[PDB]
Design an enzyme around this catalytic site. Structure first.
Site, short mmCIF file in Angstrom:
data_model
loop_
_atom_site.label_atom_id
_atom_site.label_comp_id
_atom_site.label_asym_id
_atom_site.label_seq_id
_atom_site.Cartn_x
_atom_site.Cartn_y
_atom_site.Cartn_z
N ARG A 165 16.32 7.16 1.33
CA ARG A 165 16.51 7.20 2.76
C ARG A 165 17.15 8.52 3.14
O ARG A 165 17.74 9.15 2.29
CB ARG A 165 17.45 6.09 3.14
CG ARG A 165 16.85 4.69 2.97
CD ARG A 165 17.09 3.83 4.21
NE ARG A 165 16.06 2.83 4.41
CZ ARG A 165 15.50 2.53 5.58
NH1 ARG A 165 15.82 3.19 6.70
NH2 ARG A 165 14.55 1.60 5.73
N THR A 189 1.24 -6.61 3.82
CA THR A 189 1.95 -6.23 5.14
C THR A 189 1.03 -6.22 6.32
O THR A 189 -0.16 -6.47 6.11
CB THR A 189 2.43 -4.84 4.80
OG1 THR A 189 1.19 -4.19 4.40
CG2 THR A 189 3.41 -4.94 3.69
N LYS A 227 4.83 -6.20 -6.38
CA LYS A 227 4.39 -5.53 -5.18
C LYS A 227 3.92 -4.11 -5.44
O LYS A 227 4.67 -3.28 -5.95
CB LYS A 227 5.49 -5.43 -4.14
CG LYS A 227 6.36 -6.66 -4.26
CD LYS A 227 6.93 -7.06 -2.96
CE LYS A 227 7.12 -6.03 -1.87
NZ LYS A 227 8.35 -6.60 -1.17
N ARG A 235 9.09 -17.51 2.17
CA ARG A 235 9.54 -16.28 1.64
C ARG A 235 10.94 -15.96 2.18
O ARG A 235 11.20 -15.91 3.37
CB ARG A 235 8.64 -15.15 2.14
CG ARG A 235 9.29 -13.74 2.16
CD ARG A 235 8.15 -12.78 2.25
NE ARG A 235 8.59 -11.40 2.11
CZ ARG A 235 8.92 -10.59 3.15
NH1 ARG A 235 8.97 -10.77 4.47
NH2 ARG A 235 9.28 -9.37 3.00
#
Lengths: 461, 461, 461, 461
Positions: free
Chosen positions: B73, B278, B220, B32
């Protein structure tokens, strides 16, 4: 369309082509030749006629040679007159084929009657019309006590329930009837009075002695010994014919339907055809309608799972041969149509093919085969689909006629697995058995010798 | 041998070939590239080295490009200093990128923060470190109540649990990253923050625009919208990646395992690989052993049925990259070995093949495939048999590395069905995956365009 | 021990006690009184003897009163001479009971021949021997086309398949037979020629009108109509008697076994006894041995699943009444013994009781019952265990004699569920049907009105 | 309503009634007393308060005394100061209780440390913080090589993974703890560090020695020997506690989930409760939210099938005891609601009872029980129905709280089987678990000593 196949005995009322053709039409699939009677020229013409009809119409049939086989008979009586036996009396059997019998004694055609029997043994006469008990044996004599009133006629069948008889497997004439059979090339031989596997092998040895090595041998179970040796007989033959009438003379009545059931089930599990035979529509030898009891008995053979049903005198000499073929068929069609598949390496493939065919609703299963094994292996599960069996062996095409729900088709060549799928597709469609948009399941063997079915393939027409 | 495949993120500590080589050995199967960091030359050498080791050892691997993704963010702070927020306090977000925040307010990079949010909504910051409630929205301002004490650093991740965000499918760097992805020929692109099928299609189009049409896209799922749109996402993707961590910040904790479950199950049913990702061995970023909690989690993802497990920091920057690859595989091997087939047109054929493979004990299933569909269709049932998958497509060969228990093999041609059986037999043997006398079940498509598996055959080696 | 029960018709040769005793002994479970003949005092003495034998030996039996029912005859002919009708010919029926017929028309006993018929209807004469088309009806005349050659004798049954006849259900002479039946207290009434549910009710209303409300009503399906209304008939009756012979006259042969099968199956599902009746061992009216065809027909009825089989003339007037009871029974024992349970609120409980009994190997199931429903409900699954049925209702004990494999026993009281288990254990042992250490499964109803079976309990003897 | 039960450790922050009452309300079902700390007065008041809340609210709970058990510990250090060990270094363990350790050596509380260990063996210290290899054993000395850097503090726990230790079943203070246990009438004792059946029996004998014979014993499996002796331990215990964390230091990590799985499955089969325990929501000792990994692990233990889940520190001394109870239960409720029955003499009766409950949709199964066996036997199948369990034994009512999905109810008498159905009906209704017209399945034992469940009954409320 029916699946259960119908074997018809052909006689002189039914041998013309015209008739032959009318019969294939009403449901006939195999012609049976009963060598209990007729000569070689009559039979030959009969074979020829069938073959004619066949060639003329594109229909397929198969030809079953029934042997006459070993027998014990009573012989002649005074003035050719019947004699009345009376229960309790003493009656005596003599091996002396010279004696001319009367109310006290008669001769038997079987020089071993003395040795094979034993005091206490039962003797039955004229397909069981009269029974007697053996009281004593000495010199050429069997002495008995008649256990029931009846008229003894001339030349009558004797049964020796439970007894093993030393007659050989093949009567004498018997041998010449198989050579003939080989010369004409019949597709099956139904051998009478089989009692042990040794008896099969003898018939195979003759056949093979005369170029008849590819002829399927159908052992007829007709008495207790045979019933006993069922498994080994079954192993040696290519198939079976259960003869209810004969069994019902040799064994306890309440056991005859159980014997049929059992034999039928072992056949199907062994991938060997089985025929249900005596006493099917016998009343039609005289009427144009069967009785209700008769209709249920055939139905119940189909339900027991036979591949074929057979007409005897109903089709050889009765007054309504075509009416029997015809009711015999609606009954097959009707029984057949309410039956279900039985799913419960060849095996794995073939059960899967069937299970799949059903899950995808395919109306047709196409099988390639050399010896007929894979068409039988699919038929073992009682598919709803029809089985379209392609083959390059003529004999195999013929013999598959006898198998439940198979439709054999002779092809010039099957070059390869994808070649089969292509050809199988063409034919599927050419056969009017399926149409554009039906799923079809095609089974065959790939890089494996004949005798192994290892490949299944689904296709859309 | 394990079946579950291992996805490893390659970093600068793991990029040498020597390493790459010790990892393929430990169980890595896919490398990956996490485009959250690194530049194109780094990554390229990375691919190059891997491709090196591959050609040098004959090992096969695949390459997956991880996009970085759109994000919200928080931005800068006065003096670059952290500010402590206190529960109860008012705090405010401003869409004005010029603002330099303090303990009262901070700026966000996401212009649509005030339109997508709503009074009452929860904002999370810095991967859930601080939460707040939205009390008012006006002008460029979102005013909340901090629900908990914590220190706000600069430039942190924001989560809007339950909220649908109108960020775009892709980010301006994401698009360059995929063109690069396309120039380098990666096998898969894992697209981040997928929320609706539309996002997929955008991704597909961008790849198609640059010759990457054969690259498999892995969506994802990272949030509740995604979760809700699972089904149309899945439909459009070639696979999925379940990002538990993200999920765990976006939705109720108690639902996350259930989400993972559901999504693994629908992938296997749809024939689309899925990756469990994850939070797998993260402790090993610092220790040379995972914690027992950790071990169960993976084990359980294998048991939920995943095709692959993914290493993150553990293998890219941690101190024990190769200890993590190795404990990851013992776990794989150990879980995988206690699983069972799940039998319960393409489908019928494949279930049967597997079903037959197990009845005849075949250690290997050999499949022919262009796209990979048939190898995945057979894996649906969690065979005990390894899948040997022959294909002339290289991309297909690569992508199949990601599939559970498949061993892919590139061949120069498969001229025909019989051809395949002969070919597959040689290779089966050549692969030391079976030996003379083993049964092998061979699956393919016969006289059907790619995307149909309609044929199954059993053979002995 | 056999399970299938045997109904025997008693006549003057079989009515002594002596005989009655020898028959119970051979397997008789039910005495049938054929009201087609005999008078009330003969009948009464018959009942009384049976009852004597019972009381003297402890055996149980039940008593079935057959009604005679409605009919349609052709009557007399010129000189008592047969006349052969020929296809195409016109032939005609007159309602005038005074006419003496010939080859062109005859007299029928049923004044309503003309109104119920309709041009185009079919008239069948002589158990279907000759069929005709209705061309014309005028005056006391129904005019038809003979559709087939045959000879009309005198006093011949007529069938009007498909047609509904205005004959009442209960013949005003028949009505008298039921009153008698009620006074004597027979257990069942078998009603003839049921065509529709309205016919049942009529029987029930007569019985209720005379204290015979607890008498079970068995409807005899004997024609097309009835066959058609089978479901509604079934619902109204307490059971059924499938009269194959009559059916075989009215409907297509090849359907007659299928009707029997169906009917048997819906009985069992409904918890309603079913008898299989005409043409069972008829040959024994004259011989001491049945034919092999007859023996499989019965067997097959037992396999179809009937609760009982019935002897007609074989036991009322033939030369070997006791030989037929006795072969009837070996055949029952023999068939019964190779059969299997059929598992596939009352229902849940009873299925379970049976399934449990088999898993634990119990040789016996014990049931408490008022109306008999719970004994029938367990019998629905063809348990291998014998059913020992306790009941305080005398009628209940008698009628249960007719149920497959139930052994009824009359008890003075069943005070409670725990009382039943204690009692039922005593009796299980007392019965020599189980011994110390066998598991026994006990079923009953607990705090529910009769008609619900809700409780199962396993115990060790 | 959740079925899975929740065991909460009670400390000083949670011991108030108020608190106890708030937790009963969040899902607390049992209170655990961890005898690794506190004195008898504390614990007694703790019992008292819980008993108070109980009586005051009518809630039921159970009390579980956790033994501290035997250990090996490292002792003191020079000046009470930590010493840093360095990998590669030699470090030595001494049996000599008097030594005061430093960086080269330290003493252990366990005299048998030298005999039980072996060259080559691994010793772990401080919950696996440091590991070392045994190089030599001599005199009172075990000399090793430190395998990793770390600092050794004083008085620390030691693991001899794979090693069997001759520590006794119980510590001296453990004995006093049980006596107190018995005085207080705790419902269960969880015995620590059980390695072999002999250990269970010891515990049983001491309990029996002090009137504690009705206290259920829960063995804690904490190590490889334990694991190895699983089966005989189980057999002797009334249940099990799987200590994942301990397992995770003693055995290969990858085996630990499989350990849990196996043991949960054999407990359910043996009708013995099981508790899943260490490492459940420990992060909440400090946060008000578990982590996503954490939530999956629990859920997954409920899915493995445990009867209960246990809070430790989270509920004894953490900052959010009641938030941990509360998330523990949402996760229980949510995992439990997506489970299914497992159907796949007591047994037969019970499976059917559940099988029937489901087929008739009964929301409740009511069971009568002296010892708790039949309630467990119904629970074996993971019913969707709640189990209402009537008993006259108070200990039994208490211990049944611990079982999955059982609602225990203490009644004054159950006079008879019909009595039970009557009572059970009232209570079913009285419990608002069912309503008029709901089907209920009632299970018990009829005419059988406790320990046999042989009766199942369906009723409508």
């Amino acid at each position: 369309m029916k699946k259960t196949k119908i074997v018809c005995t052909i006689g002189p009322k039914t041998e013309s082509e015209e008739m032959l053709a009318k019969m294939l039409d009403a449901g006939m699939n195999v012609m049976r030749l009963n060598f209990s009677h007729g000569d070689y020229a009559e039979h030959g013409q009969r074979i020829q006629n069938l073959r004619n009809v066949m060639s003329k119409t594109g229909k397929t049939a198969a030809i079953l040679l029934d042997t006459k086989g070993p027998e014990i008979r009573t012989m002649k009586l005074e003035g050719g007159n019947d004699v009345s036996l009376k229960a309790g009396q003493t009656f005596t059997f003599t091996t002396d084929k010279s004696v001319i019998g009367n109310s006290e004694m008669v001769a038997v055609t079987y020089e071993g009657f003395t040795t094979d029997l034993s005091v206490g043994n039962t003797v039955l006469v004229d397909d069981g019309l009269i029974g007697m008990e053996v009281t004593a044996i000495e010199g050429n004599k069997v002495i008995c006590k008649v256990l029931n009133n009846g008229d003894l006629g001339e030349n009558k069948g004797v049964n020796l329930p439970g007894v093993s008889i030393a007659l050989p497997a093949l009567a004498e004439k018997d041998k010449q009837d198989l050579i003939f059979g080989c010369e004409q090339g019949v597709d099956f031989v139904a051998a009478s009075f089989i009692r042990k596997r040794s008896d099969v092998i003898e018939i195979r040895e003759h056949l093979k002695a005369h170029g008849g090595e590819n002829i399927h041998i159908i052992s007829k179970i007709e008495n207790q010994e045979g019933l006993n040796n069922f498994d080994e007989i079954l192993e040696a033959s290519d198939g079976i014919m259960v003869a209810r009438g004969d069994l019902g003379v040799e064994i306890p009545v309440e056991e005859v339907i159980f014997a049929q059931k059992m034999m039928i089930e072992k056949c199907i599990r062994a991938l060997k055809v089985v025929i249900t035979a005596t006493m099917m529509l016998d009343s039609m030898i005289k009427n144009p309608r069967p009785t209700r009891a008769e209709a249920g008995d055939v139905a119940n053979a189909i339900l027991d799972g036979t591949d074929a049903v057979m007409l005897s005198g109903e089709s050889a000499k009765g007054k309504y041969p075509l009416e029997a073929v015809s009711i015999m068929a609606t009954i097959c069609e009707r029984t057949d149509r309410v039956m279900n598949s039985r799913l419960e390496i060849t095996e794995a493939v073939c059960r899967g093919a069937v299970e799949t065919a059903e899950k995808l609703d395919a109306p047709l299963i196409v099988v390639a085969t050399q010896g007929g094994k894979s068409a039988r292996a699919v038929r073992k599960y009682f598919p709803d689909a029809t089985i379209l069996a392609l083959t390059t062996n003529e004999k195999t095409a013929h013999q598959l006629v006898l198998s439940k729900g198979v439709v054999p088709q002779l092809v010039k060549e099957i070059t390869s697995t994808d070649d089969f799928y292509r050809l199988g597709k063409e034919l599927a469609l050419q056969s009017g058995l399926a149409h554009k948009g039906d799923v079809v399941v095609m089974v065959s063997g790939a890089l494996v010798p004949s005798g192994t079915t290892n490949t299944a393939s689904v296709h859309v027409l």
